[PDB]
Design an enzyme around this catalytic site. Sequence first.
Site, PDB file in Angstrom:
ATOM      1  N   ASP A   1       0.821  -1.208   0.000  1.00  0.00           N
ATOM      2  CA  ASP A   1       0.000   0.000   0.000  1.00  0.00           C
ATOM      3  C   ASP A   1       0.860   1.265   0.000  1.00  0.00           C
ATOM      4  OD1 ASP A   1       0.714  -0.391   2.711  1.00  0.00           O
ATOM      5  OD2 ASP A   1      -1.349  -0.271   3.456  1.00  0.00           O
TER       6      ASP A   1
ATOM      7  N   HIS B   1       0.873   3.885  -2.857  1.00  0.00           N
ATOM      8  CA  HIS B   1       0.605   5.256  -2.420  1.00  0.00           C
ATOM      9  C   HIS B   1       1.601   6.211  -3.085  1.00  0.00           C
ATOM     10  CE1 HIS B   1      -0.462   8.327   0.823  1.00  0.00           C
ATOM     11  NE2 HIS B   1       0.685   8.796   0.362  1.00  0.00           N
ATOM     12  N   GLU B   2       2.882   5.858  -3.051  1.00  0.00           N
ATOM     13  CA  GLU B   2       3.888   6.742  -3.624  1.00  0.00           C
ATOM     14  C   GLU B   2       3.756   6.856  -5.140  1.00  0.00           C
ATOM     15  OE1 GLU B   2       5.096   8.441  -1.385  1.00  0.00           O
ATOM     16  OE2 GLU B   2       4.781   7.076   0.282  1.00  0.00           O
TER      17      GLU B   2
ATOM     18  N   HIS C   1       1.052   9.153  -6.232  1.00  0.00           N
ATOM     19  CA  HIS C   1       1.362  10.581  -6.240  1.00  0.00           C
ATOM     20  C   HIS C   1       1.835  11.015  -7.632  1.00  0.00           C
ATOM     21  CE1 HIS C   1       0.587  11.938  -2.225  1.00  0.00           C
ATOM     22  NE2 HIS C   1       1.436  11.099  -1.656  1.00  0.00           N
TER      23      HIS C   1
ATOM     24  N   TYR D   1      -0.466  20.354  -3.296  1.00  0.00           N
ATOM     25  CA  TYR D   1      -0.244  19.603  -2.055  1.00  0.00           C
ATOM     26  C   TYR D   1      -0.416  20.461  -0.804  1.00  0.00           C
ATOM     27  CZ  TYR D   1       1.580  15.474   0.405  1.00  0.00           C
ATOM     28  OH  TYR D   1       1.748  14.355   1.186  1.00  0.00           O
TER      29      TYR D   1
ATOM     30  N   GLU E   1      -3.711  13.250  -1.055  1.00  0.00           N
ATOM     31  CA  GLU E   1      -3.383  12.193  -0.099  1.00  0.00           C
ATOM     32  C   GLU E   1      -4.380  11.038  -0.128  1.00  0.00           C
ATOM     33  OE1 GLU E   1      -1.103  11.039   2.076  1.00  0.00           O
ATOM     34  OE2 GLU E   1       0.095  12.266   0.711  1.00  0.00           O
TER      35      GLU E   1
ATOM     36  N   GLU F   1      -3.285  -3.009  -2.962  1.00  0.00           N
ATOM     37  CA  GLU F   1      -3.133  -4.050  -1.948  1.00  0.00           C
ATOM     38  C   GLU F   1      -4.184  -5.153  -2.130  1.00  0.00           C
ATOM     39  OE1 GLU F   1      -2.030  -2.867   2.047  1.00  0.00           O
ATOM     40  OE2 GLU F   1      -3.554  -4.210   2.861  1.00  0.00           O
TER      41      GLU F   1
ATOM     42  N   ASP G   1      -6.492  -5.002   3.434  1.00  0.00           N
ATOM     43  CA  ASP G   1      -7.322  -4.327   4.407  1.00  0.00           C
ATOM     44  C   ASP G   1      -7.500  -2.888   3.970  1.00  0.00           C
ATOM     45  OD1 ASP G   1      -4.911  -2.841   5.244  1.00  0.00           O
ATOM     46  OD2 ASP G   1      -4.331  -4.783   6.072  1.00  0.00           O
TER      47      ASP G   1
ATOM     48  N   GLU H   1      -6.526  -0.412   5.908  1.00  0.00           N
ATOM     49  CA  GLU H   1      -5.584   0.303   6.761  1.00  0.00           C
ATOM     50  C   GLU H   1      -4.396   0.696   5.907  1.00  0.00           C
ATOM     51  OE1 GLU H   1      -6.316   0.557  10.486  1.00  0.00           O
ATOM     52  OE2 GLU H   1      -8.100   0.260   9.237  1.00  0.00           O
TER      53      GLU H   1
ATOM     54  N   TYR I   1       4.663  -0.404   9.751  1.00  0.00           N
ATOM     55  CA  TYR I   1       4.531   0.515  10.876  1.00  0.00           C
ATOM     56  C   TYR I   1       4.687  -0.213  12.208  1.00  0.00           C
ATOM     57  CZ  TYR I   1       2.461   4.340  13.620  1.00  0.00           C
ATOM     58  OH  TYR I   1       2.237   5.357  14.524  1.00  0.00           O
ATOM     59  N   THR I   2       5.473   0.378  13.110  1.00  0.00           N
ATOM     60  CA  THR I   2       5.631  -0.091  14.497  1.00  0.00           C
ATOM     61  C   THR I   2       5.750  -1.605  14.646  1.00  0.00           C
ATOM     62  OG1 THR I   2       3.234  -0.003  14.897  1.00  0.00           O
ATOM     63  CG2 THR I   2       4.529   1.935  15.498  1.00  0.00           C
TER      64      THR I   2
ATOM     65  N   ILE J   1       4.428  -3.270  17.763  1.00  0.00           N
ATOM     66  CA  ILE J   1       3.007  -3.196  18.090  1.00  0.00           C
ATOM     67  C   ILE J   1       2.193  -3.870  16.994  1.00  0.00           C
ATOM     68  CG2 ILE J   1       1.038  -1.692  18.595  1.00  0.00           C
ATOM     69  CD1 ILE J   1       3.087   0.512  19.270  1.00  0.00           C
TER      70      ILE J   1
ATOM     71  N   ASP K   1       1.474  20.241   8.537  1.00  0.00           N
ATOM     72  CA  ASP K   1       1.282  19.185   7.551  1.00  0.00           C
ATOM     73  C   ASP K   1       0.651  19.735   6.265  1.00  0.00           C
ATOM     74  OD1 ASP K   1       1.153  16.489   6.510  1.00  0.00           O
ATOM     75  OD2 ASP K   1      -0.888  16.322   7.286  1.00  0.00           O
TER      76      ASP K   1
ATOM     77  N   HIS L   1      -2.372  14.969   5.403  1.00  0.00           N
ATOM     78  CA  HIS L   1      -2.407  13.579   5.880  1.00  0.00           C
ATOM     79  C   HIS L   1      -3.441  13.371   6.978  1.00  0.00           C
ATOM     80  CE1 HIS L   1       1.781  13.876   4.256  1.00  0.00           C
ATOM     81  NE2 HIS L   1       1.473  12.681   3.778  1.00  0.00           N
TER      82      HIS L   1
HETATM   83  C1  LIG Z   1       2.088   5.811   3.134  1.00  0.00           C
HETATM   84  C2  LIG Z   1       3.043   6.348   4.198  1.00  0.00           C
HETATM   85  C3  LIG Z   1       3.848   5.209   4.831  1.00  0.00           C
HETATM   86  C4  LIG Z   1       4.017   7.361   3.591  1.00  0.00           C
HETATM   87  C5  LIG Z   1       3.378   8.671   3.155  1.00  0.00           C
HETATM   88  N1  LIG Z   1       4.445   9.467   2.503  1.00  0.00           N
HETATM   89  P1  LIG Z   1       4.027  10.760   1.429  1.00  0.00           P
HETATM   90  O1  LIG Z   1       4.382  10.446   0.009  1.00  0.00           O
HETATM   91  O2  LIG Z   1       2.593  11.145   1.735  1.00  0.00           O
HETATM   92  C6  LIG Z   1       5.129  12.046   2.124  1.00  0.00           C
HETATM   93  N2  LIG Z   1       4.933  13.216   1.295  1.00  0.00           N
HETATM   94  C7  LIG Z   1       5.854  14.209   1.268  1.00  0.00           C
HETATM   95  O3  LIG Z   1       7.012  13.997   1.608  1.00  0.00           O
HETATM   96  O4  LIG Z   1       5.582  15.261   0.450  1.00  0.00           O
HETATM   97  C8  LIG Z   1       6.333  16.495   0.427  1.00  0.00           C
HETATM   98  C9  LIG Z   1       7.130  16.626  -0.840  1.00  0.00           C
HETATM   99  C10 LIG Z   1       6.684  17.484  -1.852  1.00  0.00           C
HETATM  100  C11 LIG Z   1       7.404  17.616  -3.039  1.00  0.00           C
HETATM  101  C12 LIG Z   1       8.582  16.895  -3.226  1.00  0.00           C
HETATM  102  C13 LIG Z   1       9.037  16.041  -2.224  1.00  0.00           C
HETATM  103  C14 LIG Z   1       8.313  15.898  -1.037  1.00  0.00           C
HETATM  104  C15 LIG Z   1       2.774   9.407   4.350  1.00  0.00           C
HETATM  105  O5  LIG Z   1       1.594   9.279   4.635  1.00  0.00           O
HETATM  106  N3  LIG Z   1       3.664  10.179   5.072  1.00  0.00           N
HETATM  107  C16 LIG Z   1       3.288  10.965   6.237  1.00  0.00           C
HETATM  108  C17 LIG Z   1       3.753  10.427   7.601  1.00  0.00           C
HETATM  109  C18 LIG Z   1       3.237  11.304   8.741  1.00  0.00           C
HETATM  110  C19 LIG Z   1       3.119   9.047   7.769  1.00  0.00           C
HETATM  111  C20 LIG Z   1       5.271  10.265   7.692  1.00  0.00           C
HETATM  112 CA   LIG Z   2       2.691  -2.187  14.018  1.00  0.00          CA
HETATM  113 CA   LIG Z   3      -3.057  -1.814   4.027  1.00  0.00          CA
HETATM  114 CA   LIG Z   4      -2.577  -5.512   4.643  1.00  0.00          CA
HETATM  115 ZN   LIG Z   5       1.250  10.732   0.317  1.00  0.00          ZN
END
Ligand SMILES: CC(C)C[C@H](NP(=O)(O)CNC(=O)OCc1ccccc1)C(=O)NCC(C)(C)C
Ligand SMILES: [Ca+2]
Ligand SMILES: [Ca+2]
Ligand SMILES: [Ca+2]
Ligand SMILES: [Zn+2]
Length: 316
Positions: A138, A142-143, A146, A157, A166, A177, A185, A187, A193-194, A197, A226, A231
């Site tokens: 996922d 997700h990436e 974008h 953004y 987002e 997924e 799921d 989620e 993550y963690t 946990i 943020d 997010h």
């Molecule tokens: C799916 C998750 C694991 C990763 C996800 N990463 P994302 O791609 O949304 C982080 N976005 C971000 O860094 O944008 C800012 C950006 C804008 C232009 C160029 C480079 C960077 C996220 O929710 N990040 C936010 C956290 C609070 C969870 C770290």
């Molecule tokens: Ca965990």
């Molecule tokens: Ca998932």
């Molecule tokens: Ca899963």
């Molecule tokens: Zn993102």
Amino acid sequence: ITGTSTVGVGRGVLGDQKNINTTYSTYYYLQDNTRGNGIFTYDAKYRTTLPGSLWADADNQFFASYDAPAVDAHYYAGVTYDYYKNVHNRLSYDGNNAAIRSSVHYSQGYNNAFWNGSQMVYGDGDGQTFIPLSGGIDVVAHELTHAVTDYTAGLIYQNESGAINEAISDIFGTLVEFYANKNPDWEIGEDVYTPGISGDSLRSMSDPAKYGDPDHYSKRYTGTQDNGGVHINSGIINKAAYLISQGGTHYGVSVVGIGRDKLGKIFYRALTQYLTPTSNFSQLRAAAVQSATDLYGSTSQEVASVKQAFDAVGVK
Ligand SMILES: CC(C)C[C@H](NP(=O)(O)CNC(=O)OCc1ccccc1)C(=O)NCC(C)(C)C
Ligand SMILES: [Ca+2]
Ligand SMILES: [Ca+2]
Ligand SMILES: [Ca+2]
Ligand SMILES: [Zn+2]
Ligand SMILES: [Ca+2]
């Protein structure tokens, strides 16, 4: 690089064995020639200069601990490519088979992943908050989503457009997924993550509020953190998407679920034919209603369900 297409084998972040498409020329490179104009995975070597080096391996076996995040970034990029091509007839993120590039081992203890405008980038995590983030299908989807968004709707953004941006990434991350069909799921990021946990995740689409994210427009964040809560406020749209697919009664409003495939078709059409860089939540509702109308007809259950879901989350 120029070489011959080969198939390597290795283990991912979670210890699962998988085959990966590689290219042989002296070394075996993480270069998959079977999809579009290639999927390329790079080693950032704990530094922040990108992309780093195209991942080279002597024997086409990727079982070292250091290999695991590369195996998964490479493999899950392939799955995500397949999803977009097979399900939406979209060829890579730009619709023209652009080469897909990812770097792993970015920085040290880096608890995030991102699209930098040109490529995907994955931290290894600090081992407490995250393990290497490419271990989540996922997350990878997700990436890559974008990139899809940036080439299509171009949602800015920040604030509401950014929260839609987002949510689009969480929605398609989740649909990918499910497409892969391994422990799916609603989620986000649960696989990476963690590690200490069990049972938690970064976000929940089914119940965003479990992690304090809003599940109704009246609970939207309006501050500046943020990027204006991209997010955080994504929870409102994630909840709407979840309801469209799975149904439910939310703040007294009942939604008849129409399933994942139709959710995907509706949101993909909205993303690619109606949303613009400045779309707000109300405009997303309009885009989704119109998309469902195009696909299923104005009098359809699908259209009614889209309206019910946005009603349920307080978006008019
Ligand atoms: C799916 C998750 C694991 C990763 C996800 N990463 P994302 O791609 O949304 C982080 N976005 C971000 O860094 O944008 C800012 C950006 C804008 C232009 C160029 C480079 C960077 C996220 O929710 N990040 C936010 C956290 C609070 C969870 C770290
Ligand atoms: Ca965990
Ligand atoms: Ca998932
Ligand atoms: Ca899963
Ligand atoms: Zn993102
Ligand atoms: Ca090797």
